[PDB]
Motif scaffolding. Structure first.
Motif, short mmCIF file in Angstrom:
data_model
loop_
_atom_site.label_atom_id
_atom_site.label_comp_id
_atom_site.label_asym_id
_atom_site.label_seq_id
_atom_site.Cartn_x
_atom_site.Cartn_y
_atom_site.Cartn_z
N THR B 38 0.81 -1.22 0.00
CA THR B 38 0.00 0.00 0.00
C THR B 38 0.84 1.27 0.00
OG1 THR B 38 -0.27 0.56 2.35
CG2 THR B 38 -1.58 -1.25 1.50
N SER B 39 2.14 1.17 -0.20
CA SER B 39 3.03 2.32 -0.11
C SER B 39 4.39 1.91 -0.64
CB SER B 39 3.13 2.84 1.33
OG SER B 39 4.09 3.88 1.42
N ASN B 76 -3.06 9.93 -1.22
CA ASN B 76 -1.77 9.33 -0.91
C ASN B 76 -1.09 10.06 0.23
OD1 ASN B 76 -1.52 7.32 -3.19
ND2 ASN B 76 -1.78 9.21 -4.36
N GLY B 80 -0.44 7.52 3.30
CA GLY B 80 0.92 7.09 3.50
C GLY B 80 1.38 7.45 4.89
N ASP B 94 4.23 9.24 0.36
CA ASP B 94 2.89 9.14 -0.18
C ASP B 94 2.57 7.70 -0.58
OD1 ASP B 94 2.66 11.90 0.17
OD2 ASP B 94 3.48 12.31 -1.81
N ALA B 95 1.31 7.33 -0.40
CA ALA B 95 0.85 5.96 -0.60
C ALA B 95 0.63 5.69 -2.09
CB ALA B 95 -0.41 5.72 0.23
N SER B 96 -0.05 4.58 -2.41
CA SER B 96 -0.17 4.08 -3.78
C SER B 96 -1.36 4.72 -4.48
CB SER B 96 -0.30 2.56 -3.80
OG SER B 96 -0.85 2.14 -5.04
N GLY B 97 -1.06 5.71 -5.32
CA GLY B 97 -2.08 6.34 -6.13
C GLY B 97 -2.78 5.36 -7.05
N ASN B 100 -5.44 3.80 -4.99
CA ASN B 100 -6.51 4.77 -4.78
C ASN B 100 -7.32 4.97 -6.05
OD1 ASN B 100 -3.97 6.46 -2.96
ND2 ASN B 100 -5.50 5.07 -2.10
#
Lengths: 82, 143, 206, 63, 145, 141, 100, 56, 63
Positions: B38-39, B76, B80, B94-97, B100
Motif C-alpha cells: 500500500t506504499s 496518498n 501514506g 505518499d501511498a499508492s495512487g 486509490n
RNA sequence: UUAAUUGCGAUAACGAACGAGACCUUAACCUACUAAAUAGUGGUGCUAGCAUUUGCUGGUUAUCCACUUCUUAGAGGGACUAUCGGUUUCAAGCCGAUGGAAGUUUGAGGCAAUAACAGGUCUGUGAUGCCCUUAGACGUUCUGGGCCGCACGCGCGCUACACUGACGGAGCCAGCGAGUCUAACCUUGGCCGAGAGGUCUUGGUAAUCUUGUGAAACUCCGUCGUGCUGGGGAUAGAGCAUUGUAAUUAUUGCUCUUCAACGAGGAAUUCCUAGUAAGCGCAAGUCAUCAGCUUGCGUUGAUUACGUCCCUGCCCUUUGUACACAC
C-alpha cells in the motif's frame, strides 16, 4: 577489540503455544481466586504464550467467569464473578 | 431525528460499511490484492488480507463525503506516512495512487461516487442516502 | 438527582457525575485524608479532576508544584527515560489501568492506598557531602517534606519502570503491585527498600 | 531589576518641583498630563516617570 | 475465544530444504527464518497455498508443505508478478529466478568470482574485503578486518 | 431576531470559534457532536465545564463550533475555553450579570484556564543550538 | 469601469500618505470603492554568517526586507481615472493598476 | 510579469550598482548620493553633490 | 521507631559548600517551647512541619 | 541596594560624555476605530441526504444581503510593578498577596563602549603593498583521474539495544516559508504502472494555485510475544525508474533476497530552570539530482533548584610580590 559487556544467559522461557486437556481444565479451575487477572497473570501462573492468553481471556469473558472492566488494547483487565 | 456520518463515530462505522460491502460482494476487487504494501514505506502488507480493500474504500468514501473534492495525490498524502530509511531518519511518504485510483474507479462503477469538476471526485446522492442509512443501521446496531 | 436530556443525548454515567459530584471517571477524591501531618500542606487533594492531565504552569514558582495535583505529578514523572518524553496521554492511560487494577484489588480507595504508600516510603533523613581537600566525607541531615514527596514518586516510578523493562509484566500492573507493596510495607518495593537503606546509612554516619 | 535611572528620577523631581499643585497621586492623570507637559519620546518611559512621580508624591503626603 | 487442544499432529520441529524449522511460531516467520526468503515472499506464497497464517507450523500437512515448496521452486507457474524475485534476468538465461537456502550463496560466489576473474573493481573489492558500494572507508567500519 | 453570539478560544496555535444561540440543547463541532472528539479522555476534559455547571444551562441552546491549528490537545483546550467564553457571553448578553459572575466564578475556581488562555507563547530558535537554550555540544580535543 | 489599483512597497508612511490622498481624492470626487485591502506583510529573510572567512566562532545574521501590499477595486470614468493615475506619484513606492 | 519580490530586489541592486558606479567616477566631484524616483515612462536620478557644473 | 514531629519556625540560612542545605530553628510540638536548630536538605519554608528521627542535636555548620 | 558605577546617599570634589538602561523588532491582550470574495462569519435564494415536525449535516461565486469575533494589516490604547500588606537608613529598594492578557529589566532577540590580539582571512572582493611567475606561464582552456583513497586515533550527528514496544489497519491536526518570461519553478486534476516513476492536461509572478501543505509523533483497534525474536538494519547480490554530456569507487529512489555488531555503555565529559529541555516531524539555504548538515518553523511536552562559590572562571576593593614578551 573490547566489549565492555557481560552477556550472560537466562531461563529462555518455554511459554506454551499450544495446549492440552490438562492445561485446559487447569486454567478453568485456576483462573478463579484471582481478584486481579491479566495476560501476564495467565503467563506467569500458566506458562503460556500471549496469543493463548489473549484468546483465552476472550474465551472466558465470552463464556462468563471473568468479568472485564476495561478492554483497552495492549492491556485487558478482568475480575472474576463471585 | 436525521442522521449523519458526523453524528456517528468513525471506526465502528467503517467496519460495518466494509463488512456490508464485503457481504454484497459487488465491489469488483482488482485481483492483485494480497500482493502489495500500500506504499513504498509500509514494511509489510496488511493482515486482514482478504479484507482492507473494503475498509480502504469505506474510509475514503467517508472522507470525500465529509470533504467535497479530492485527488489521488491528496489521498496518498493522507494514507501514506512514516518510512524507516534504515539508519537514516524517518520521513513522510505518499501511498499508492494506483490503489486509490482503482478503489475510486470501483466506487464510480457502483455509482456511490461521482467525478466532480474543479478537479476530483465527490459523494453522490445515492451514496449520501445509503451512507446515512448505514449510519442509522450502526446507531441501532450498538444497542 | 434528575437524569436530564438534551438535543444531543449524553451517557447517563457522565450525566450523573455532572449532576452529583466531581470525581475521577469513577473515583471520589474525598475520604483520601492522609495520615502524615508532615506531608499535608505538601500533597494536593480536595481539588478533584476527572482526568490526570492539565498544563498548569506549576514549575514557574517554587512550591506551586506542591499545589499541583499529585497524580499529574505522577504522570509527569512517568513520562521520562528519553523515548517516552511527552506521551502524557499514554501516561494517563497507564494511570487509568493501574488505578482500575488497584481498585479491583485493595478494594478501598486506590487513591487512598497510593497516598498511604508514598507517605510510607518517604525518606526522612539523608546524607550529604563534605569535600575536605584530599578526601571526601559524609554527614547525615534531615529532609524536606516536599523532598520526601519528590523522592518517593521518583522511587516508585523508577522501580516499576525497570521492572517493566525487557519483560512481559507491563508497567501498569508492576506499578500497581509496587504501590500496594509500598502501602502495606512489603520489603519488596524498590522505594521502601532504598528509603530505609538510605536512612540506615544516614543513622550510621550521624 | 525594578530600579529606575537618574534621568527618570531627576525628571520626576523637576516636575514635582514646578507642577506639585497641578498634579496628584493618580497614575492615570499624571500620565495624561506628563504626555503634554513634558515632551517625551517614549510611552513606556512616560509610564515609568508617572509611577515614580506618584511614589514621590506619596512620600510628600507622608513626610 | 476459540480454544482447542493440539494433539500429536503438532510437531515441535521439522525439515525444509536442508534446514530445520521451528513450530510454535507463525508459519510465515518460520519461512523467513528459512534462507532465500523473507516476509514478503513468505506471506505471498502462504496466501497462494490458501492456508491459515494465524495457525502455527507443527499442525500442518506434508501435502500443504510440498504444495508450498512446489510454489517456491516453480513460482511463475503459480502466477507471481516476476519482480518479487531475488534474481531477475539472470545473466546466462535472462530468466527471473529465486535462489534458495544453498543456491543463494552458490550463485553469489559464482558471480563474485566471475567478477574476480574478469578483474573488475567490484570483484577485487569483494576479494580484499574492502567496501564495494562506493562507501567512505577511511574512518568508520574498521572492525570487520 | 435571533439571540446569538460568536466567540472563540485560543491556545498555542489552536483557535476554536463557536457560534452560540437559543436552540434546543445541541452541541456540534465540525458538524459533529461533542461525543466524537477522539483523544478518548479529553472528551471528559471538555465536558468538564458543562458538567461543573450542570446541563440545566444547556437545555434550549445550540452551539456549533469549528476549529483549526496545532495539535489535537491544543484544539481541545481552545474548544473548552471557547464554549465557556461563549456561554459567559450569552449570559452577559441575555441572562443576568448575577448568573454571569457566579458562572465565571465557578469556572475560575476550577481553573483560570477555562476563560483566560495560556499566554506561554513558544520561544524562538537561536544559533548555537538545536533549540532556544540547548546549545549543541562542547569539544576541545 | 472596474479597475484594480495596487501598491507593492516597503516605505510604510510613504505608502500610507499615498493611500490617504488617494482615498480622499476618490471620495471628494465621490467615486465608489472598496477599502484599502491590506495584504499580509511579507518579510524576505536572508540568514547567513557574519564572518567572510571560515574561522572564528559561528554567528548568524538575519537580514529582513519588509514588504507591504495594498489594493482597491474601483469604478470611475476615464477622465477622473487618468487624472487619478497621473497624480499621486510618490517616490519609493511601487504602483500598478489593471482593468477587468 | 515577474514577481514583486524579485522586482524590488532588482530595484535595490540596481540602486546599489549605479551608486557604486557613481561613487567611483564622480568621486572627485564631491559626490554624496543619488535618488531614482520611479515614474510612469520615466525614472530620475538626482545626485546630491557639490561640484555641480563639473559633474554636468 | 519513636520520632518527634517538630515545625520549622525560622530559617537561619543556607549552608553546604554548594548551597544544597540550610539551617533552621524548629520547635517541638510535643513538649512545646522546646526549640532546636538543625539542618534540612530540600526546599522548605516557614511554619513547616517535619518529622525528626531524634531531638538531641544541633549541627552548627558544614562545608 | 541593583542584572548593572543601576540608585540611595557618603564625600576635594564639581560638572559632563560613552557603555548599560534608554531605543528598535517580534511574540503575546484589544468582540473599540479603518476596513476587505487574494481572509472569513451568518442569512438569503438554487440544491443533496436523513428526518421529516420546525430541524441537522452538506454542495452552490456572480444567488445575492449584512458583519468583521476569528483573519489580516494601520493608527492607537494598554503594565508603570497598579493596589494592598509586611520589610528596609525606613531611603533606594526587597518579599508576599489581590486584581490583571501579561508583575524573573513581561519574554526572546537586535543594537551593542575605551583599550587590545603581533587571533582568522591576501582562497569573497578589479581593495591589496613587497616578492615570485608571465608563453614548452604558477595565466586560461580541453580530456581523464583527484580531493571519498584505510593499518589506526580523535569531534560533531543519525540509527537502535522493544512492550511507555514493532508491524498492519482506521481516525488523523499545524505553522514558518519558496515558487515559470523570455524561463521552463511550484505543480493540482485525471490515465497507466506494485512502486519509484511516466503520461496528456490545468492554475499560479501569488493571502489568490501549488496547500487546509490532510507532516510526523500521535491516538483507537487488531498480529506479536521477552525469543540477538516481526528489535535493529549496516553488510552484500540481482532487477526496475529518474537526474545529468557522462553514473564505473553502486548519485538518488523503488522492489525482492542476505539480516552483522548492539542487551543502557569504563575511565571521563557536554547542554540545560520553562512551553525551556527532550521527543516529533516540517519548510528554506546549498541545489540539475543527492540530507544523517545548518538556519528557521511550528506539534507532544517532564522531573529536578529559586541556592552556593566546593571545582572551573568572572567583577570590585584591600594586601603582598625578586612579575611587565606580565604564573
Amino acid at each position: 577489540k573490547k566489549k565492555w559487556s557481560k552477556k550472560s544467559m537466562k531461563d529462555r522461557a518455554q511459554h506454551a503455544v499450544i495446549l492440552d486437556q490438562e492445561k485446559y481444565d487447569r486454567i478453568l479451575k485456576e483462573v478463579p481466586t484471582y481478584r486481579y487477572v491479566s495476560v501476564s497473570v495467565l503467563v506467569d501462573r500458566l506458562k503460556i504464550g500471549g496469543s493463548l492468553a489473549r484468546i483465552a481471556l476472550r474465551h472466558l469473558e465470552k463464556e462468563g467467569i471473568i468479568k472485564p472492566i476495561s478492554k483497552h488494547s495492549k492491556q485487558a483487565i478482568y475480575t472474576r464473578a463471585t | 431525528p436525521g442522521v449523519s456520518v458526523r453524528d456517528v463515530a468513525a471506526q465502528d462505522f467503517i467496519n460495518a460499511y466494509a463488512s456490508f460491502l464485503q457481504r454484497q460482494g459487488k465491489l469488483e476487487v482488482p485481483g492483485y490484492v494480497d500482493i502489495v504494501k500500500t506504499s513504498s514505506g509500509n514494511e509489510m502488507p496488511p493482515q486482514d488480507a482478504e479484507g482492507w480493500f473494503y475498509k480502504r474504500a469505506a474510509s475514503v468514501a467517508r472522507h470525500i463525503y465529509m470533504r467535497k473534492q479530492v485527488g489521488v495525490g491528496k489521498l496518498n498524502k493522507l494514507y501514506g506516512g512514516a518510512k524507516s530509511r534504515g539508519v537514516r531518519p524517518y520521513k513522510h511518504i505518499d501511498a499508492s495512487g494506483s490503489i486509490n485510483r482503482k478503489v475510486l474507479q470501483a466506487l464510480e462503477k457502483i455509482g456511490i461516487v461521482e467525478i466532480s469538476p474543479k478537479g476530483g471526485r465527490r459523494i453522490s446522492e445515492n451514496g449520501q442516502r445509503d451512507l446515512d442509512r448505514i449510519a442509522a443501521q450502526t446507531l441501532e446496531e450498538d444497542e | 438527582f434528575t437524569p436530564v436530556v438534551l438535543a444531543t443525548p449524553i451517557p447517563e454515567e457522565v450525566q450523573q457525575a455532572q449532576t452529583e459530584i466531581k470525581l475521577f471517571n469513577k473515583w471520589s477524591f474525598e475520604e483520601v485524608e492522609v495520615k502524615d501531618a508532615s506531608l499535608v500542606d505538601y500533597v494536593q487533594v480536595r481539588q478533584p479532576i476527572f482526568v490526570a492531565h492539565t498544563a498548569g504552569r506549576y514549575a514557574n514558582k517554587r512550591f506551586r508544584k506542591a499545589q499541583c495535583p499529585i497524580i499529574e505529578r505522577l504522570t509527569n514523572s512517568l513520562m521520562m527515560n528519553g523515548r517516552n518524553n511527552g506521551k502524557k496521554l499514554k501516561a494517563v492511560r497507564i494511570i487509568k489501568h493501574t488505578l482500575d487494577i488497584i481498585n479491583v484489588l485493595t478494594d478501598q480507595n486506590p487513591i487512598q492506598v497510593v497516598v498511604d504508600a508514598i507517605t510510607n516510603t518517604g525518606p526522612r533523613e539523608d546524607t550529604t557531602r563534605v569535600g575536605g581537600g584530599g578526601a571526601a566525607r559524609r554527614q547525615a541531615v534531615d529532609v524536606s517534606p516536599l523532598r520526601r514527596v519528590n523522592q518517593a514518586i521518583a522511587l516508585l516510578t523508577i522501580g516499576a519502570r525497570e521492572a517493566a523493562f525487557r519483560n512481559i509484566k507491563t508497567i501498569a500492573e508492576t506499578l500497581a503491585e509496587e504501590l500496594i507493596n509500598a502501602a502495606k510495607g512489603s520489603s519488596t518495593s524498590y522505594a521502601i527498600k532504598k528509603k530505609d537503606e538510605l536512612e540506615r546509612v544516614a543513622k550510621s554516619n550521624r | 531589576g525594578r530600579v529606575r535611572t537618574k534621568t527618570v528620577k531627576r525628571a520626576s523631581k523637576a516636575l514635582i518641583e514646578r507642577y506639585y499643585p497641578k498634579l496628584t497621586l493618580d497614575f492615570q492623570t499624571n500620565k495624561r498630563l506628563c504626555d503634554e507637559i513634558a515632551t517625551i519620546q517614549s510611552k513606556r518611559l512616560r509610564n515609568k516617570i508617572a509611577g515614580y512621580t506618584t511614589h514621590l508624591m506619596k512620600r510628600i503626603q507622608k513626610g | 475465544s476459540l480454544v482447542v487442544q493440539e494433539q500429536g499432529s503438532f510437531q515441535h520441529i521439522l525439515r525444509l530444504l536442508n534446514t530445520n524449522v521451528d513450530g510454535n511460531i507463525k508459519i510465515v516467520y518460520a519461512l523467513t527464518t528459512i534462507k532465500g526468503v523473507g516476509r514478503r515472499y513468505s506471506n505471498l506464497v502462504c496466501k497462494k497455498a490458501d492456508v491459515d497464517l494465524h495457525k502455527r507450523a507443527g499442525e500442518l500437512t506434508q501435502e500443504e508443505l510440498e504444495r508450498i515448496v512446489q510454489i517456491m521452486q516453480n513460482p511463475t507457474h503459480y502466477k507471481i508478478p516476476a519482480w518479487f524475485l531475488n534474481r531477475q534476468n539472470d545473466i546466462t538465461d535472462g530468466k527471473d529466478y529465486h535462489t534458495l537456502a544453498n543456491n543463494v550463496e552458490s550463485k553469489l560466489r559464482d558471480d563474485l568470482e566471475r567478477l574476480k576473474k574478469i578483474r573488475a573493481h567490484r570483484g577485487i573489492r569483494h576479494f580484499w574485503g574492502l567496501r564495494v558500494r562506493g562507501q567512505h572507508t577511511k574512518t568508520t567500519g574498521r572492525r570487520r578486518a | 431576531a435571533v439571540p446569538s453570539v460568536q466567540t472563540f478560544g485560543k491556545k498555542k496555535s489552536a483557535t476554536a470559534v463557536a457560534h452560540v444561540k437559543a436552540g434546543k440543547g445541541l452541541i456540534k463541532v465540525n458538524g459533529s457532536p461533542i461525543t466524537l472528539v477522539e483523544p478518548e479522555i479529553l472528551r471528559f476534559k471538555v465536558y468538564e465545564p458543562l458538567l461543573l455547571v450542570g446541563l440545566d444551562k444547556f437545555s434550549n441552546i445550540d452551539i456549533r463550533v469549528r476549529v483549526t491549528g496545532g495539535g489535537h490537545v491544543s484544539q481541545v483546550y481552545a474548544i473548552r475555553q471557547a464554549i465557556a467564553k461563549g456561554l459567559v457571553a450569552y449570559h452577559q448578553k441575555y441572562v443576568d450579570e448575577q448568573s454571569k459572575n457566579e458562572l465565571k466564578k465557578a469556572f475560575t475556581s476550577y481553573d483560570r484556564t477555562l476563560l483566560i488562555a495560556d499566554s506561554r507563547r513558544p520561544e524562538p530558535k537561536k544559533f548555537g543550538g538545536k533549540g532556544a537554550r540547548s546549545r549543541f555540544q562542547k569539544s576541545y580535543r | 469601469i472596474k479597475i484594480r489599483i495596487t501598491l507593492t512597497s516597503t516605505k510604510v508612511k510613504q505608502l500610507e500618505n499615498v493611500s490617504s490622498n488617494i482615498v480622499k481624492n476618490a471620495e471628494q470626487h465621490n467615486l465608489v470603492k472598496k477599502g484599502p485591502v491590506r495584504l499580509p506583510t511579507k518579510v524576505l529573510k536572508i540568514s547567513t554568517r557574519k564572518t567572510p572567512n571560515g574561522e572564528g566562532s559561528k554567528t548568524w545574521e538575519t537580514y529582513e526586507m519588509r514588504i507591504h501590499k495594498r489594493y482597491i477595486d474601483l469604478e470611475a470614468p476615464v477622465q477622473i481615472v487618468k487624472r487619478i493615475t497621473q497624480i499621486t506619484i510618490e517616490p519609493g513606492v511601487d504602483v500598478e493598476v489593471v482593468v477587468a | 510579469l515577474i514577481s514583486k519580490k524579485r522586482k524590488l530586489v532588482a530595484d535595490g541592486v540596481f540602486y546599489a550598482e549605479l551608486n557604486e558606479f557613481f561613487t567611483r567616477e564622480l568621486a572627485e566631484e564631491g559626490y554624496s548620493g543619488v535618488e531614482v524616483r520611479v515614474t510612469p515612462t520615466k525614472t530620475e536620478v538626482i545626485i546630491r553633490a557639490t561640484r555641480t557644473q563639473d559633474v554636468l | 521507631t519513636p520520632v518527634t514531629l517538630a515545625k520549622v519556625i525560622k530559617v537561619l540560612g543556607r549552608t553546604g559548600s554548594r548551597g544544597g542545605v540550610t539551617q533552621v530553628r524548629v520547635e517541638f510540638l510535643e513538649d512545646t517551647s522546646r526549640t532546636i536548630v538543625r539542618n534540612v536538605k530540600g526546599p522548605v519554608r516557614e511554619n513547616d512541619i517535619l518529622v525528626l528521627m531524634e531531638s538531641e542535636r544541633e549541627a552548627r555548620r558544614l562545608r
